[PDB]
Amino acid sequence: XXXXXXXXXXXXXXXXXXXXXXXXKXXX
Amino acid sequence: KGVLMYGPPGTGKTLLARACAAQTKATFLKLAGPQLVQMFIGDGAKLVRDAFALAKEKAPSIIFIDELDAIGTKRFDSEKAGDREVQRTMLELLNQLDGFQPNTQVKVIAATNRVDILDPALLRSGRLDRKIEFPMPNEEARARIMQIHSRKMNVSPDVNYEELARCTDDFNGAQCKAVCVEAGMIALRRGATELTHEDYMEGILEVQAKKKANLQYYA
Amino acid sequence: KTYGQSTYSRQIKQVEDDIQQLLKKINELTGIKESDTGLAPPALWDLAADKQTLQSEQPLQVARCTKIINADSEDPKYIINVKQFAKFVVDLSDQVAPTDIEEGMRVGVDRNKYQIHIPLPPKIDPTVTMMQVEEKPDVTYSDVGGCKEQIEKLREVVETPLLHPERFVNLGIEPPKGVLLFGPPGTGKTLCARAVANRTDACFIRVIGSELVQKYVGEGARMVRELFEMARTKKACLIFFDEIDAIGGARFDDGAGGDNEVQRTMLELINQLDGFDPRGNIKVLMATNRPDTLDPALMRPGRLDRKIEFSLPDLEGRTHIFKIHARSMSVERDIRFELLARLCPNSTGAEIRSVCTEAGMFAIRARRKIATEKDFLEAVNKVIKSYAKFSAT
Amino acid sequence: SRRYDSRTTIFSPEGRLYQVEYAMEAIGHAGTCLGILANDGVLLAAERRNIHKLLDEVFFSEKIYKLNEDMACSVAGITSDANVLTNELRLIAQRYLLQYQEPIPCEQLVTALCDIKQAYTQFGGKRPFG
Amino acid sequence: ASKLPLVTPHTQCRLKLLKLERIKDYLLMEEEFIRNQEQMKPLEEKQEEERSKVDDLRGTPMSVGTLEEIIDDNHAIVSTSVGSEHYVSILSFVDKDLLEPGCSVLLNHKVHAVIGVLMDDTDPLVTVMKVEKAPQETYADIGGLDNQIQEIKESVELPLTHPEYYEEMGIKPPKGVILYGPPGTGKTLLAKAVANQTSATFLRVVGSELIQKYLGDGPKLVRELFRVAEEHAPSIVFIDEIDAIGTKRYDSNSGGEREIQRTMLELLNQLDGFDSRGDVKVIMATNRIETLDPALIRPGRIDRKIEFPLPDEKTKKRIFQIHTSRMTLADDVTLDDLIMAKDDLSGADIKAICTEAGLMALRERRMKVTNEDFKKSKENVLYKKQEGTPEGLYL
Amino acid sequence: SQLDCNFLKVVSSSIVDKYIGESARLIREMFNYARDHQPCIIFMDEIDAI
Ligand SMILES: Nc1ncnc2c1ncn2[C@@H]1O[C@H](COP(=O)(O)OP(=O)(O)OP(=O)(O)O)[C@@H](O)[C@H]1O
Ligand SMILES: Nc1ncnc2c1ncn2[C@@H]1O[C@H](COP(=O)(O)OP(=O)(O)OP(=O)(O)O)[C@@H](O)[C@H]1O
Ligand SMILES: Nc1ncnc2c1ncn2[C@@H]1O[C@H](COP(=O)(O)OP(=O)(O)O)[C@@H](O)[C@H]1O
Ligand SMILES: [Mg+2]
Ligand SMILES: [Mg+2]
């Protein structure tokens, strides 16, 4: 009877992937 | 450490806040009461602490807080929510103002309407040092205020403010401003340029808002 | 079985009925493509489908939207989050000018090299979009007859500075930026609200008073911020409140464990109304039925200046409201209304219009084409007897 | 001074009484009695509400209160609210005998009590008899 | 579809007879022109050629997004399943007309452009509150009102079924109707009877279920109720039992009762403040009428107030008949043993009798009907009333 | 002011967060930091929040 409330958060997860055939030099 | 304004709600408290911010050149920082109340939990303790860290980086700095009664409340046996975040942000305000790790590079001005809600922890002597009441304008201040707001308007120079201040009974600075505003438009109704004593007396009849009639069985 | 109501009754009907059936039977005969789980009908995209869609494929981009935190010196060097992807330090592309890229702005950023292309309008949540009225009802000032004093006071305040900012300059005053309206119900509060929203020349913004009470704390305050932020952008806008008793009337503290969240919301309305950096060009109208149990912080002038009341007029407003409501209907030319108004001394304009709508029912209690004065006599015969032995009265 | 009054005198907004109806529902609980006559003689039935096995029962008389040489009564309600009424009604029957030297008829004795019980409902805000 | 908007004669005027036969001519000739397309060049130009141009234009995997806002004509902002938002342009293949915010879309891979729309489901709130079908008995159930039937018919049904008389004089129908009287009269019956024989949608609302232990949800349920009722159809909103939820400002207290005040204050504005709702029929039912807030009672909100009395010996003879119309009846019973005697008891009491006689017979495993069934059932329904009565002797 | 190296102070109000865990996760890290340095002092003013 007439009572407020606060809240909360449930953050999702995250993930990434690639073909992984890229070289990272290009320097020299 | 800290200056508190309090009084009746029309005596002028936002004035000296805006006035001294107008005159000084330090980093003036505003803050309202219900801005510290947020939806999720935390978020005032985040908000108060980030507010003072901004005041440290700009070391000549003054923080003004208005409607401190919205967050300053004498705690008791409270259930559910509502208060169960408000006192949490209030304690963060107490700690980040005074006590552990003191500072001298920030000054706090607060102003309420009602005093008796507040904690003794807010009022202690080191959180808010000076306590400044604002009384209602007694006689001559009512004559003084109505002269101030009569600056721009075309006043016929046969007007005694002491006659006005004696008949403006129990007004505040907001109502004495309102009588000066209404008396200009009443002269605009009939197209007169200057004013009269009758113009102010009719403005007093409008601000007091006399409702009805047939009150004639007196005298 | 039945009878003709007017002469060729079915003869015009089935001529209309089968051609609406035939407008269907055109389309399936031509071949119609409907209900194809969310597409367009084929008659207008077959000449859209080809290479001026490839003009939207290859020249156009995706342009992922973002948000700006701050700027830097001598150069843009903008710090920007996406929303939940990563915060970046990025630059504008050359198609913009570095002027309207101010902070706290939703902007669109290229997906490949992360550069700014388009500034976007800010996030206005729809709950306050649905209270901007965006249309204006047809209510004339003449329709609120019987209120010659009350409209004239309200003309002076809401209307005249917004349409003549001249006389107030030439005398040197400030208009009374807020007006309260009150009185007994059914008297014309909402009429004057619609009639000013008619001739507004402004961004009229409706507010229902009980839309602020919510379940969570502080979110009811966050509405009031977004109102006065759009108010400072939409220059010279009007805001109408209605039934402000729900927004808050008292500060009950004897047993301070009752209502608090409405008090916090009501205090937020106090600060953004007056105090610390005034609002400029915003006028506020309020309307309640009991203007007695309100907080005197609202009653301070500067906030609520004029207390206009709405009474039951005398004897001649009723004759004029008769001439407002019973101009617009189909009656006999033998009208008189001083006879009618003297029979109902204490009545609202709602009770006036209730009689005029009751009067049309008697002609439909009968089988007539018209409204007779004697029928309207018999209309005012019953409603005197109806209001004498009414249930609530 | 004025906010502590209970207002047990005003009618109900329905247009009836408001406090007496609360009182009459206490009689239905805590007691059950009856009496039957059709010829020469009359009986009274009582019921022990508290029948615990550590009472004395040395009164040798009970709810039947012999108030006269020709009359008695059977009471149900608040217990010591009756002891005010039984001592009062016993003396009304006795001051009648002082006045006339003739025993009191059973009709007008009942009218003497019912004028007393009404008088607390008429005026004062005194708590009525349950 | 929206072929011609004119209806303005609205009668047997010759103007409509001319206009609609023009519309008959422009439609026949458009048909007879296009009939001679599949006669002389009967080509199938866009069976798959329209489709295979576009199914190859869109990607083969489709991805469902969500609308957030709509900007000028082609580019709008969307939201992916995780929250990444894209400022993509829509094509002229999707129905732009049913494209409102809060809807699922179909997207692309490279440019993520809006390709199509997925149709919506049915909201649960209709399935909660709407009496979905014609529930119960028709006007063969009611016992002889014939004037109360006449008022509700010309206020709701005859406006809805045959709107032609109001638009002759231009006079709008009255809006609100209050049903009131002593309890057990047939207030729920008359709502369901009109809900039986109707053509528009009907909504039943129990008023006691509008009090949440949270707060703000009082006005939240109200502002969604008329929102659904407006957006759905021609609608008739019935709210039973408003007497113990919306009475008046009796003490102006706080702590819950102030919340109940705010719910009725929203309902008062949601009933009638702004932009007259249109094709919304409001019917309200109470037991008590006196302790009601007069701001609801005023015209502009409710215009019809109908008393419900109790007949004594006349309509009961059918109410006793209708409740005994589907049961046995041995010849030892006369309904005039009970109809002629007492003159105040409700129609709900009559149903309470006519079920209890069926209870008393089959409990004792007997045959059809005795008189003593109706004797003991009438005696019981007396105690069903009287045992909750504190009345003594003349108050 | 004696130690000035081995003293932990907590306001006992900035512990709360917007997530579901993440307030315990501070407390586990605190005592584990108090586990690593051996003579530690914990100070939490104004428990009444937490
Ligand atoms: N002593 C005064 N001298 C001149 N003007 C005054 C005085 N007191 C009030 N005013 C007028 O009152 C207005 C500001 O109101 P005020 O400062 O009383 O609000 P407050 O008391 O700070 O806040 P609240 O109204 O919420 O209590 C100004 O426009 C100012 O002109
Ligand atoms: N003076 C008047 N002239 C013309 N019509 C009137 C007048 N007064 C009332 N009416 C009619 O009565 C109806 C009710 O008016 P309105 O909606 O302003 O009442 P209200 O003041 O909003 O009531 P409440 O105080 O309960 O909110 C209007 O639709 C209007 O047509
Ligand atoms: N005129 C009548 N004809 C048939 N049955 C009736 C009649 N009046 C009342 N009843 C019976 O009494 C009940 C009346 O319901 P109702 O009076 O609407 O309850 P409430 O008024 O408490 O909502 C119905 O169940 C119905 O069976
Ligand atoms: Mg102030
Ligand atoms: Mg209104």
Structure tokens at E41: 């060049």
CA distance D21 to chain E (A): 7
Strand arrangement of the beta sheet that strand C115-119 belongs to? C64-65, C107-109, C115-119, C87-92, C78-81, C67-70
What spacing in Å lies between the alpha carbon of E279 and ligand 2's midpoint? 21
Q: Which residues of B touch A9 (CB under 8 A)?
A: 40
Under DSSP, the state recorded for B163 is H
Q: Which of C140, C132, C96 is nearest to C115 (CA)?
A: C96
Please tell me if residue A5 touches chain C, with a CB cutoff of 8 Å: yes
Mutation to probe ligand 1, out of C295, C300, C303, C304 (largest number of atoms < 8 A from CB) = C300
Structure tokens at B54: 């901004």
Long-range Cβ pairs for the range D67-73 (8 Å, 24+): D67/D93, D68/D93, D68/D103, D68/D104, D69/D103, D70/D103, D70/D106, D71/D104, D71/D106, D71/D109, D72/D44
Distance of CA B79 to the CA centre of its chain: 32
What spacing in Å lies between the alpha carbon of C166 and ligand 1's midpoint? 27
Q: Which of E106, E125, E126 is nearest to E116 (CA)?
A: E106
Q: Are B179 and B204 in contact (CB under 8 A)?
A: yes
Q: How far is CA E254 from CA C252, C269, E249, E251, E342, in A?
A: 8, 21, 11, 9, 46
- Report the binding-site residues of B for ATP: 7-14
CA distance E257 to chain A (A): 9
Residue D115: exposed, middle, or buried by beta-carbon count in 10 A (0-12, 13-18, 19+)?
Answer: exposed
Question: Among partner residues B10, B39, B83, which is closest to C300 by beta-carbon distance?
Answer: B10
For chains A and C, CB pairs below 8 A equal 12
Q: Residue of the nearest CA to atom 27 in ligand 2?
A: C185
Under DSSP, the state recorded for B206 is H
Q: Which residues of F touch B96 (CB under 8 A)?
A: 11
Q: Which residues contact E91 (CB under 8 A, 6 or more apart)?
A: C48, C53, C56, E113, E114, E115
Question: Among partner residues E27, E119, E262, which is closest to C246 by beta-carbon distance?
Answer: E262
Q: Kindly list the protein residues that place their beta carbon closer than 5 angstroms to ligand 4, a single-atom ion.
A: B 13-14; C 275
Q: Are E48 and E87 in contact (CB under 8 A)?
A: no
Q: Which of A6, A8, A9, A11 to mutate to test the interface with B (most CBs of B within 10 A)?
A: A6
C209 a known binding residue? no
Q: Which ligand is nearest to the CA of C291?
A: 2
Q: Which of C248, C297, C299, C276 is nearest to B8 (CA)?
A: C297
- Type of residue numbered B69: D
What is the Cα–Cα distance from B72 to B122, expressed in whole angstroms? 8
Q: Which of E63, E58, E87, E179 is nearest to C121 (CA)?
A: E87
Give the SS3 label for residue C307: strand
C188 a known binding residue? yes
Structure tokens at C10: 């079915």
Helices (H), chain E: 14-35, 49-55, 124-129, 148-152, 158-161, 166-169, 187-196, 217-232, 257-271, 294-297, 316-322, 336-339, 347-363, 371-386
Q: How far is CA F33 from CA B100, C182, E49, F11, F37, in A?
A: 22, 66, 71, 17, 7
Q: Residue of the nearest CA to atom 24 in ligand 1?
A: B9
What is the Cα–Cα distance from E242 to E302, expressed in whole angstroms? 13
Angle CA(E203)–CA(E207)–CA(E213) in degrees, nearest 5?
120
The ligand 1 atom at the shortest distance from the C-alpha of residue C270 is 26
Strands E75-79 and B27-29: unpaired
Give the SS3 label for residue C206: strand
Tokens 């009090």 belong to E211
Please tell me if residue C299 touches chain B, with a CB cutoff of 8 Å: no
Give the SS3 label for residue D105: coil
Physical contact, E and F (3 or more Cβ pairs within 8 A): no
- Type of residue numbered C269: L
Q: Which of C262, B72, A7, C288 is nearest to E255 (CA)?
A: C262
Q: Is E219 within 8 Å of C357 when comparing Cβ atoms? A: no
What is the Cα–Cα distance from E54 to C50, expressed in whole angstroms? 9
Residue C271: exposed, middle, or buried by beta-carbon count in 10 A (0-12, 13-18, 19+)?
Answer: buried
Q: Are B112 and B70 in contact (CB under 8 A)?
A: no
Angle CA(C9)–CA(C14)–CA(C19) in degrees, nearest 5?
140
Q: Which residues contact C61 (CB under 8 A, 6 or more apart)?
A: C110, C111, C117, E111
Structure tokens at C118: 């388009």
What is the Cα–Cα distance from E240 to E236, expressed in whole angstroms? 13
Distance of CA C162 to the CA centre of its chain: 19
Q: Which residues contact C123 (CB under 8 A, 6 or more apart)?
A: C106
Chain C partners (3+ C-beta pairs within 8 A): A, B, E
Q: Which of E57, E94, E126, E89 is nearest to E104 (CA)?
A: E94
Angle CA(E301)–CA(E306)–CA(E308) in degrees, nearest 5?
145
Residue-wise DSSP of E234-264 = SEEEEEE--TTTS---SS---TTHHHHHHHH
Q: Are C283 and C179 in contact (CB under 8 A)?
A: yes
Tokens 């957006």 belong to E231
- Report the binding-site residues of E for ATP: 181-188
Q: How far is CA E171 from CA C194, C362, C373, D84, F14, in A?
A: 21, 12, 16, 73, 66
Helices (H), chain B: 14-23, 45-57, 83-97, 140-149, 161-167, 173-189, 197-207
C190 a known binding residue? yes
Q: How far is CA C249 from CA B149, C245, C286, E232, in A?
A: 31, 6, 13, 37
Structure tokens at E368: 């059809």
Judged by phi (left if over 0) then psi (alpha if -120 to 50, else beta), residue F23 lies in alpha
Structure tokens at C38: 């969310």
- Type of residue numbered B199: D
Q: Which of E215, E262, E263 to mutate to test the interface with A (most CBs of A within 10 A)?
A: E215
- Type of residue numbered F28: R
- Type of residue numbered C92: L
Q: Which residue of B has its CA nearest to F14?
A: B45
Q: Residue of the nearest CA to atom 25 in ligand 3?
A: E348
What is the Cα–Cα distance from B12 to B141, expressed in whole angstroms? 12
What is the Cα–Cα distance from F3 to E393, expressed in whole angstroms? 89
What residues does ligand 1 touch, defined as CB less than 6 Å away? Answer: B 9-15, 113, 145, 148, 173-174, 177; C 270, 275, 297, 300, 302
Q: Are E271 and E305 in contact (CB under 8 A)?
A: no
Q: Which of C294, C286, C376, C391 is nearest to C339 (CA)?
A: C376
What is the Cα–Cα distance from B123 to B4, expressed in whole angstroms? 9
CA dihedral C64, C66, C68, C71 (to 10 degrees): -30
Structure tokens at E244: 């113990």
Q: Is D16 within 8 Å of E395 when comparing Cβ atoms? A: yes
Q: How was this structure determined?
A: cryo-EM
Tokens 């000449």 belong to C47
Q: Which of C216, C222, C252, C262 to mutate to test the interface with A (most CBs of A within 10 A)?
A: C216
Q: Which residues contact E160 (CB under 8 A, 6 or more apart)?
A: E198, E199, E200, E234, E281
Q: Are C83 and E68 in contact (CB under 8 A)?
A: no
Q: Which of C374, C304, C391 is nearest to C335 (CA)?
A: C374
Residue-wise DSSP of E160-225 = HH-TTSHHHHTPPPP-EEEEESSSSSSHHHHHHHHHHS-SSEEEEEEGGG---SSSSHHHHHHHHH
Q: Residue of the nearest CA to atom 7 in ligand 2?
A: C349
Physical contact, C and E (3 or more Cβ pairs within 8 A): yes
Q: Could you tell me which residues are beta bridge partners of residue C371?
A: C331
Q: Which of B175, B72, B82 is nearest to B114 (CA)?
A: B72
Structure tokens at E43: 């080509």
Q: How far is CA E36 from CA C30, E22, E40, E43, F20, in A?
A: 11, 21, 6, 12, 71
Q: Is A4 within 8 Å of C216 when comparing Cβ atoms? A: yes
Q: Is D24 within 8 Å of E392 when comparing Cβ atoms? A: yes
Q: Are E84 and A14 in contact (CB under 8 A)?
A: no
Q: Could you tell me which residues are beta bridge partners of residue C68?
A: C80
CA distance F22 to chain A (A): 11
Q: Which residues contact E85 (CB under 8 A, 6 or more apart)?
A: C64, C65, C83, E68, E77, E78, E79
Scanning F5-34 for CB atoms below 8 A from B yields 9, 11-14, 16-18
Chain A partners (3+ C-beta pairs within 8 A): B, C, E, F
What is the Cα–Cα distance from C45 to C51, expressed in whole angstroms? 12
Q: Residue of the nearest CA to atom 1 in ligand 1?
A: B173
Exposure pattern of C56-69 as b/e (b: 16+ CB <10 Å)? Answer: beeeebbbbbbbbe
Q: Are E193 and E318 in contact (CB under 8 A)?
A: no
Residue A21: exposed, middle, or buried by beta-carbon count in 10 A (0-12, 13-18, 19+)?
Answer: exposed
